[PDB]
């Protein structure tokens, strides 16, 4: 939720997950919501 995938704080929607590949760890700055790098 800091460098990979951010949600806004007015979210209208549903979040789903179930039990069943890299991920970023260093970048200069935060993210804006619903934006990718």
């Amino acid at each position: 939720a800091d460098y990979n995938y951010k949600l806004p704080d007015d979210f209208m929607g549903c979040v789903l997950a179930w039990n069943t590949y890299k991920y970023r760890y260093l970048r200069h700055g935060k993210l804006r919501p619903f934006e990718r790098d």
Binding site: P8, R32, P33, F34, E35
Partner: protein, 32 residues
């Protein structure tokens, strides 16, 4: 790459960008 969209005097535009959305506005005027 991800997105694609093909569809069928002073010309004025406003481009705004927020929450991962690019809003585009448009005007037209028949006339520096």
């Amino acid at each position: 790459c991800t997105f694609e969209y093909i569809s069928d005097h002073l010309r004025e535009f406003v481009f705004k960008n927020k929450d991962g959305f690019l809003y585009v506005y448009k005007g037209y005027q028949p006339i520096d």
